[PDB]
Amino acid sequence: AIQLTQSPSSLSASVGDRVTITCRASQGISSALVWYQQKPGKAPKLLIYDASSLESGVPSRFSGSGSGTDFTLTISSLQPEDFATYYCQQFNDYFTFGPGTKVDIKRTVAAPSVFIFPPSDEQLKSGTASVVCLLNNFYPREAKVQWKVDNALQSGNSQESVTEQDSKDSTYSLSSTLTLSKADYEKHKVYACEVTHQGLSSPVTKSFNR
Amino acid sequence: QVQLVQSGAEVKKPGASVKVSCKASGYTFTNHYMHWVRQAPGQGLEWMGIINPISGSTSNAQKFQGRVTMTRDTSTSTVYMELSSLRSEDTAVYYCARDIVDAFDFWGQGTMVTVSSASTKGPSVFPLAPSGTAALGCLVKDYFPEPVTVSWNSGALTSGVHTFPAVLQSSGLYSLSSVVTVPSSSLGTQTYICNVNHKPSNTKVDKKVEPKSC
Numbered sequence: 001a002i003q004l005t006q007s008p009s010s011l012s013a014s015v016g017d018r019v020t021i022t023c024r025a026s027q028g029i030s031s032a033l034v035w036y037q038q039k040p041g042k043a044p045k046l047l048i049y050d051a052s053s054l055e056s057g058v059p060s061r062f063s064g065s066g067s068g069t070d071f072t073l074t075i076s077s078l079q080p081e082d083f084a085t086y087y088c089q090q091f092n093d094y095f096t097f098g099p100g101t102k103v104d105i106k107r108t109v110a111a112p113s114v115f116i117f118p119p120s121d122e123q124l125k126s127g128t129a130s131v132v133c134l135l136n137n138f139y140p141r142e143a144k145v146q147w148k149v150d151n152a153l154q155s156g157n158s159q160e161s162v163t164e165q166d167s168k169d170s171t172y173s174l175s176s177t178l179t180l181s182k183a184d185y186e187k188h189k190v191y192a193c194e195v196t197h198q199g200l201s202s203p204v205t206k207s208f209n210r
Numbered sequence: 211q212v213q214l215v216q217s218g219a220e221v222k223k224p225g226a227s228v229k230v231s232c233k234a235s236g237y238t239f240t241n242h243y244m245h246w247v248r249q250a251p252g253q254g255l256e257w258m259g260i261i262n263p264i265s266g267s268t269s270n271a272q273k274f275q276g277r278v279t280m281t282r283d284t285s286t287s288t289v290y291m292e293l294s295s296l297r298s299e300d301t302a303v304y305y306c307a308r309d310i311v312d313a314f315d316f317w318g319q320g321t322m323v324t325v326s327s328a329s330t331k332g333p334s335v336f337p338l339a340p341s342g343t344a345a346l347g348c349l350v351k352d353y354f355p356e357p358v359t360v361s362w363n364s365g366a367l368t369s370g371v372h373t374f375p376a377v378l379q380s381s382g383l384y385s386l387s388s389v390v391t392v393p394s395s396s397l398g399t400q401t402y403i404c405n406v407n408h409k410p411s412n413t414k415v416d417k418k419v420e421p422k423s424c
Contacts, residue, residue: 036314049313055315099254115341117341120337121422123336130385159385173389
């Protein structure tokens with residue numbers, strides 16, 4: 001089965017930049033490669049088909065080239081309406097899609113400001129404990145949160161959510177919520193969230209003692 | 211001036227079925243194959259199948275064999291996607307798309323299908339209490355279905371607010387947090403209230419968030 005991969009997963013760009021993104025197929029697909037643009041809350045929009053044909057109505061700054069296993073999409077000079085996620089697709093035989101490349105608004109690296117919040121007494125009375133870690137106003141988007149409870153790595157009991165890039169300062173924020181039973185929460189003392197990001201020399205920990 | 215107009219969002223229990231419609235206008239319906247593609251929230255795109263509008267002949271991804279039924283009605287230029295025996299993995303936006311033989315050139319607006327064992331439930335709102343600049347917030351937990359709205363101080367506080375997208379928990383209930391950063395020096399005197407509205411359950415919660423007293 002054909003798999004499509006895309007690189008980079010995320011690209012920082014500025015208005016006026018030349019942008020090139022790549023799509024690779026696991027075996028030859030031979031020109032049958034489509035590029036789509038997608039913005040939040042909207043359906044994908046067609047840009048290029050047959051790996052080099054620009055669809056009518058699409059601005060001429062977009063172009064595509066490639067064949068076989070390797071394809072590129074180029075934006076000659078990026079405009080504000082081009083910040084979006086871009087997907088490639090094989091237009092044959094399971095119609096499979098690449099995983100997308102998001103092109104976002106570049107700014108200087110900004111390390112997250114990190115905050116940890118214990119569960120409230122009100123919530124604990126009902127039998128569940130949510131511990132929240134906030135990573136505020138960071139850039140680029142890539143960031144990692146690890147939860148440690150009494151120095152033990154937590155797996156399978158947290159969920160993350162991220163905002164869209166802020167229109168005023170070009171940052172992201174992220175929440176990570178660790179969910180435990182009340183009994184499990186009460187069995188342990190040290191609750192730590194550990195954050196990795198380009199702006200941090202080494203992981204930063206925020207913690208509390210229950 | 212092609213338009214593909216899909217039916218509205220659906221909320222379903224595991225084991226149930228859903229039937230999504232896609233009405234095509236502005237072109238000759240029988241000139242183009244129609245496809246269905248889905249996209250789980252925050253994730254990529256997954257092809258489901260294809261239908262010939264002339265003959266009704268259809269093929270689908272093997273993952274959906276025996277569960278998906280695609281049909282067409284030429285009198286109304288509408289295609290349908292029925293997915294039976296729903297499970298959590300089926301929660302996604304479902305799109306119809308027009309085949310142009312080298313691409314999909316027009317797509318429907320999408321139909322959200324949420325599969326959950328939950329029923330209508332209003333949220334519990336808990337404080338994210340403030341521990342320069344301080345962060346505080348509200349955890350809006352265990353509601354169904356979407357959406358909730360969150361404001362701060364009845365709309366008077368907007369600067370520094372971040373309201374995160376909801377996440378569907380393994381329990382089938384949604385949760386989200388809303389946070390705000392404020393001056394630490396304001397914590398003793400300025401009241402911070404998160405106003406949460408969940409219209410499906412007629413639940414309105416105004417939660418004051420303050421430093422926890424020790």
